[PDB]
Amino acid sequence: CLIPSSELQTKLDKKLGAGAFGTVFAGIYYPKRANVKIPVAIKVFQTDQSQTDEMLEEATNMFRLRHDNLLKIIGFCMHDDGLKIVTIYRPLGNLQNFLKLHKENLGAREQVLYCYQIASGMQYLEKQRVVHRDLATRNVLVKKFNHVEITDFGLSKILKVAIKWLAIEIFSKHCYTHASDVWAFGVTCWEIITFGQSPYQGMSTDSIHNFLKDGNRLSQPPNCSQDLYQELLRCWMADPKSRPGFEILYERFKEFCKVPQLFLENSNKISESDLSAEERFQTERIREMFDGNIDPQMYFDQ
């Protein structure tokens, strides 16, 4: 539920990243009932001392969101400085840096699986009437080669370069809906297909608005099939109502996972030596981030 200071340690020297609206630090979680150490990531939001009943209401609502493809929120704590959101630390990093690093060895099965698992988590969020508002590969974490998790969800009432994932209607009026998440999901899939290159690379803001207003979309990658590109295209409809829901998108990509090399050209497939090398890289990142304080199995046993 609510974590006190006696159970949390914020490593202010282990800054994980910048953030649109809040920095993230590595940390260790000490459950008082159990001498077990849990490597965690601590996101710090300092928002005008807004320690109100509304912030507690949306902290527990976000805490009850449970799904295998959602990053588990271990707990929360509200301070005078602001709000800290604690999540389980993932040594592999976000999907954006993960796609670039493993561009040459990730297979077509892994790419369709990421789109499927992300669509699986978004379906749970949609059924919970929760708008993510910031869906992208940078906000998707990699647990292992065949398992990704969505993070930074449910920050609507809690409160940039994300224009590349912004639907057309958001430019005119601010109305973050589930249909706008479907748009960002289409761009998110495009990142996975292109192994994490930047959308609208030869462009800039706000020319993207008129580029999308003139009916243009992101070009089909050379490795993307036509049946898969039509899915991204229908994620980018002009009318917000004409776009499919994550209920439809979940059933589509699940059928795509049956034969993944039928929708993406990828000569590479994951090797069992890379599975063992991935396990060695996770223990290394755990040993370095916490200076041997965290036993690597403690994270694996979790």
Ligand X SMILES: Nc1ncnc2c1ncn2[C@@H]1O[C@H](COP(=O)(O)OP(=O)(O)NP(=O)(O)O)[C@@H](O)[C@H]1O
Numbered residues of the known binding site for ATP: 16-24, 43
Interacting positions 142-171 with Mg ion (CB under 5 A): 152
Which residue in 10, 82, 93, 274 binds ligand X (CB under 6 A)?
Answer: 93
Interacting positions 20-49 with ligand X (CB under 6 A): 20-22, 24, 41
Least distance (Å) from Mg ion to the CB of residue 136?
8
Query: Could you give the CA distance from residue 40 to residue 187 in angstroms, rounded to a whole number?
Result: 29
Query: Could you give the CA distance from residue 28 to residue 58 in angstroms, rounded to a whole number?
Result: 24
Q: Is the backbone of residue 196 left (phi > 0), alpha (psi -120 to 50) or beta? A: left
* Residues 86 and 73 sit within 8 Å (Cβ to Cβ): yes
Least distance (Å) from ligand X to the CB of residue 15?
8
By beta-carbon proximity to ligand X, the closer residue of 15 and 103 is 15
Q: Which of 272, 269, 294, 285 is nearest to 97 (CA)?
A: 285
Asked if 138 interacts with ligand X (CB under 6 A), we say yes
Identify the helix (H) or strand (E) that includes residue 11. strand 8-17
Which residue in 28, 122, 141, 286 binds ligand X (CB under 6 A)?
Answer: 141
Query: Is residue 301 annotated as part of the catalytic site, yes or no?
Result: no
Asked if 134 interacts with ligand X (CB under 6 A), we say yes
Give Cβ neighbours of residue 251 (< 8 Å, ≥ 6 apart).
none
Least distance (Å) from Mg ion to the CB of residue 299?
20
By beta-carbon proximity to ligand X, the closer residue of 22 and 186 is 22
* End-to-end CA gap in the chain: 18
Counting residues that bind ligand X (by CB under 6 A) gives 22
Other C-beta atoms lying within 10 Å of the C-beta of residue 166: 20
Least distance (Å) from Mg ion to the CB of residue 21?
9
Asked if 89 interacts with ligand X (CB under 6 A), we say yes
Which residue in 16, 119, 130, 179 binds ligand X (CB under 6 A)?
Answer: 16
Task: Give the active site residue among 68, 81, 134, 274.
Answer: 134
* Residues 96 and 216 sit within 8 Å (Cβ to Cβ): no
Exposure string of 79-91, with b = 16+ CB inside 10 Å and e = fewer, is eeebbbbbbbbbb
Asked if 139 interacts with Mg ion (CB under 5 A), we say yes
By beta-carbon proximity to ligand X, the closer residue of 17 and 31 is 17
Tokens found for residue 247: 């209920």
The SS3 call for residue 270 is coil
Give Cβ neighbours of residue 240 (< 8 Å, ≥ 6 apart).
167, 169, 177, 179, 180
Least distance (Å) from ligand X to the CB of residue 46?
13
Annotated binding site: 16-24, 43
Which residue in 123, 151, 180, 194 binds ligand X (CB under 6 A)?
Answer: 151
Q: How far is CA 72 from CA 15, 31, 49, 63, in A?
A: 20, 16, 25, 8
By beta-carbon proximity to ligand X, the closer residue of 83 and 264 is 83
Which residue in 69, 120, 123, 139 binds ligand X (CB under 6 A)?
Answer: 139
The length of the chain is 302
Residues that bind ligand X (CB under 6 A): 16-22, 24, 41, 71, 87-90, 93-94, 134, 138-139, 141, 151-152
Positions marked active-site? 134
Residues that bind Mg ion (CB under 5 A): 139, 152
